[PDB]
Design a protein around this ligand. Structure first.
Ligand SMILES: NC(=O)c1ccc[n+]([C@@H]2O[C@H](COP(=O)([O-])OP(=O)(O)OC[C@H]3O[C@@H](n4cnc5c(N)ncnc54)[C@H](OP(=O)(O)O)[C@@H]3O)[C@@H](O)[C@H]2O)c1
Ligand SMILES: NC(=O)c1ccc[n+]([C@@H]2O[C@H](COP(=O)([O-])OP(=O)(O)OC[C@H]3O[C@@H](n4cnc5c(N)ncnc54)[C@H](OP(=O)(O)O)[C@@H]3O)[C@@H](O)[C@H]2O)c1
Ligand SMILES: NC(=O)c1ccc[n+]([C@@H]2O[C@H](COP(=O)([O-])OP(=O)(O)OC[C@H]3O[C@@H](n4cnc5c(N)ncnc54)[C@H](OP(=O)(O)O)[C@@H]3O)[C@@H](O)[C@H]2O)c1
Ligand SMILES: NC(=O)c1ccc[n+]([C@@H]2O[C@H](COP(=O)([O-])OP(=O)(O)OC[C@H]3O[C@@H](n4cnc5c(N)ncnc54)[C@H](OP(=O)(O)O)[C@@H]3O)[C@@H](O)[C@H]2O)c1
Ligand SMILES: O=c1c(O)c(-c2ccc(O)c(O)c2)oc2ccc(O)cc12
Ligand SMILES: O=c1c(O)c(-c2ccc(O)c(O)c2)oc2ccc(O)cc12
Ligand SMILES: O=c1c(O)c(-c2ccc(O)c(O)c2)oc2ccc(O)cc12
Lengths: 248, 248, 239, 249
């Protein structure tokens, strides 16, 4: 049959464009979501109208806790249950908010380190334990070495995700599983953000003075899972329009 | 009084101990944090106090991630203020290190490896900064991008530590607190480790075919806390004998 | 139909790159220094597929007082043949040891000239003469764990990373993207094969070219200053 | 006897501060210079008046050419001729100016910006090692090499090559006991011709104190790397940039 993929946080924005584009490439998809139940079911309905029985949703909180490993095991299990295989994992879900050094701190750690680093690691474990062109793509951050002031925990999580991309690429290569990253600079700006601030950020991008479309991020993800990336593992592709190259 | 004070985590033994000794030799009063090594911590404090009265205290604390970790970290920093009326230097040296293959429960492994290596340093950094030649030195790892097989969680935590070193340096620079790292390659080898195994590692180091002494690592810490590094923040000094330059 | 220049295109990786660009519908300049018969054989094979879509261009890419003119000429040949030049692939490369303990200045001319200076000059000519415009530079995934006694080669490849970033920044306003592909062990010039995590073998040249094709494509329209490793995980492996 | 050091471009600015700190630590120094003759002799006179016969000057163009290997050989020779040894090499000399992609010919820009920043360090490294305790080489790198100034491609190329050299040499020279490390300023002494207004624009970007590194602060990191406190450090590049390289656009 057709291969299958899990995309975490796939209801909206970049995760949705990634699930759409995998689906358009021939993949059956698990649409993982946390709070965005309506958007998720909507996407699965649209994908299923195009090719019947090719999309499911799977709800899970990816905050760190003692039950996080079971939740991650269940995300992967949902793929096998719906499609009998799981070829691609996309770790796209992410918590993102400031945690100034100067919600309790335990919750902020559980959320930002959970979603960005620990859930990826556990999903990777469960993915590998259940196992052709198998691969995992982690959504990293091109700006990880030029961080946003007061985003220590978020930054820590994405740095840990780089660590994971490298470590898992090394350890899973003998099982023919490739592990890579796509690192957006500025792509879809936060919903909460005002328009003058959105423009502040746009104007900094060398290539076009505009943020990445979700489809442009998805395009790198498609490349990495594709047959044209069969010798690529442990690589992180910046998709940032040059933004990481720009000095203060 | 007028002598500065430093907290060193995991200071009972090995590198942390050498760091505590060297700081004390430089004129610092020291909090010797420990987890299980009470006898070692106390004997070091007694030796330091014999050299100069009332210049060393111990502080016991588990740095595993949990609900209570922020309160523990707060209490470590407090201990230095209670003992010495000031806290000039934080050395995040304590570390759990053991394999976590992708293919103790896993949530415990996460708590210990990510708590000690990343979360506890972040919480100690918050408490250090909130309580204020101030600086923080984090013990990193030079081999973080060429990691040992099946050490993904340990690798994640040490990458997260780089992230913290960079984020905290940027955020704390307005308060005049510098944040840097020392990244050993192979230093003191495991206790139980066979000499034939230790030699395999030693033979890989270009500079002298030997591991760094604990004092060599401490020397880079002393530099970073010193007036000779007053413009240095966000930097990670490898102290690895060229090990990280050696291809497979 | 867009047009591409590939340097060192007569053999091995540049050949695979030329063929793949051509197969994607580019017209191609096949640059060569000493490999005339091979360049022409490739041009003949590509012109049989689609006539008048492949030309050859001779140039020495050694650093010298005339390298700027040779680089200008390479870019010119594309514009002459095809009336446009959409893609520059800096693939040509000298590779050999230069122990710290051929004259040294010839080794500088070859190893730094071919690997870094010619890419710089070709970049200037390509830019001056100017849509999906991009430059791809063939980098090296093992640049930070360099081979023993290869200082000048490593210098040249680090300089090439510097150029990829600087040019991506400077040319972004012109809509010219500048990226890198960094092979590990590809076509050898068993022990090395054994060290590679992904399948204990070298990259074929086509695997390298696949990354080049992605980077020049519409699927990479937001990508500039990026270097894609294509090394099977070799650069992750410690000593 | 006292150890001896060669500092390239040592008449003024950071190079001078490194030679002065080396000298105050007990080194004998070769003050290399290219055009700054008065400033070089003046520095050696001041250093010799502190301790006799402890400083010499040495003139050379470090621009790339077929004679550059001889000039570099001669710099290192000058240390042996003066002091009987050469313990430390500081590659500090640097040409710095824009070379936009879209007076001097391009071949001259390549020769100066690549020559001074990368080829001369490589040739001086070869000579220093071939002419051979705590031996080391320190290369002055650039903390902002990955976030480069617009239109400085050749300069950036040169400094990237210098990183490459630092790593390759550290690795190849480790068996000889020679350490090779880098110190990478962000903004330290501003260019003499830069207006205060532009200087303050750069100052204001530095997280740690909104000011440039002093020459002494750069020199302090050099001193560290040559000292017994860094006897296990090779192939490391220490940023001394007050956080500048961490600041996003
Ligand atoms: N957007 C950018 O410019 C940019 C820049 C750098 C990196 N990135 C990275 O690119 C990826 C996609 O970016 P984005 O802006 O599309 O992401 P986003 O909208 O900020 O988040 C994507 C989804 O993650 C899920 N999520 C958040 N907390 C969660 C939790 N505790 N448990 C489970 N899921 C949770 C949410 O799902 P529900 O909606 O279902 O609750 C959310 O829709 C992310 O990993 C992000 O860090 C983006
Ligand atoms: N030695 C090396 O070659 C090497 C290589 C790379 C990086 N490093 C880094 O350099 C630093 C020092 O190295 P090392 O070899 O001296 O360290 P170590 O001996 O592995 O550990 C240092 C101390 O960490 C403390 N620790 C462990 N788990 C803890 C927990 N849950 N709570 C609180 N403390 C805990 C222990 O204290 P008690 O003994 O009191 O329980 C231990 O003695 C570490 O950060 C390490 O990761 C070392
Ligand atoms: N093969 C690998 O595993 C590997 C590993 C790391 C990096 N790379 C990089 O990948 C790229 C292509 O690799 P490759 O192995 O296919 O390259 P290669 O066979 O070593 O050389 C490619 C072409 O460069 C041209 N060339 C060499 N010196 C020249 C000069 N002075 N003037 C003009 N042209 C010159 C030659 O053209 P003529 O034949 O026409 O004389 C040669 O066929 C290179 O940039 C290389 O450094 C490859
Ligand atoms: N200043 C900063 O903020 C900063 C920032 C990043 C990196 N750096 C690096 O730090 C080092 C010191 O910086 P600086 O500002 O003190 O350097 P600088 O004043 O710009 O240059 C130092 C010396 O380089 C020598 N030099 C220039 N071209 C030469 C040639 N063709 N041959 C031989 N020598 C030549 C000159 O000697 P004469 O005077 O004798 O002609 C000059 O005094 C340099 O390597 C620089 O690239 C500095
Ligand atoms: O929406 C986001 C965003 O615009 C940005 C963003 C905005 C402006 C920037 O300069 C930048 O580097 C990131 O970052 C995110 C990181 C994680 C995530 O889940 C969402 C965002
Ligand atoms: O003791 C350790 C060690 O020898 C090594 C080590 C030994 C051999 C290696 O080749 C290496 O890269 C690290 O790593 C550690 C990391 C953390 C820690 O807390 C202790 C050690
Ligand atoms: O003087 C220099 C300078 O201020 C700077 C400089 C000034 C402002 C900046 O933001 C910066 O990144 C570098 O760079 C140099 C690089 C080489 C050199 O030889 C001298 C200088």
């Amino acid at each position: 049959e057709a291969p299958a993929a899990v995309v975490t946080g796939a209801a909206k924005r970049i995760g949705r464009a990634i699930a759409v584009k995998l689906h358009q490439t021939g993949y059956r998809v698990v649409i993982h979501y946390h709070n965005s139940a309506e958007a998720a079911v909507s996407l699965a309905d649209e994908l299923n109208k195009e090719r019947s029985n090719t999309a499911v949703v799977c709800q899970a909180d990816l905050t760190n806790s003692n039950v996080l490993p079971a939740s991650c095991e269940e995300i992967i299990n949902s793929c096998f249950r719906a499609f009998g295989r799981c070829d691609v994992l996309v770790n796209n879900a992410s918590a993102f908010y400031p945690t100034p050094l100067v919600k309790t701190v335990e919750t902020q750690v559980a959320e930002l380190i959970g979603t960005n680093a620990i859930a990826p690691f556990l999903l990777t474990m469960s993915f590998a334990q259940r196992q052709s062109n198998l691969s995992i793509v982690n959504l990293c951050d091109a700006m990880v070495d030029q961080p946003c002031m007061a985003f220590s925990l978020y930054n820590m999580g994405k740095h840990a995700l780089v660590g994971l991309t490298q470590s898992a690429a090394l350890e899973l290569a003998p099982y023919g599983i490739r592990v890579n990253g796509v690192a957006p600079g500025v792509s879809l700006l936060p919903v909460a953000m005002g328009e003058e601030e959105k423009d502040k950020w746009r104007r900094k991008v060398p290539l076009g003075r505009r943020e990445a479309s979700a489809e442009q991020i998805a395009d790198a993800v498609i490349f990495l899972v594709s047959g044209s990336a069969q010798y690529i593992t442990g690589s992180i592709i910046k998709v940032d329009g040059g933004l990481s190259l720009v000095h203060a």
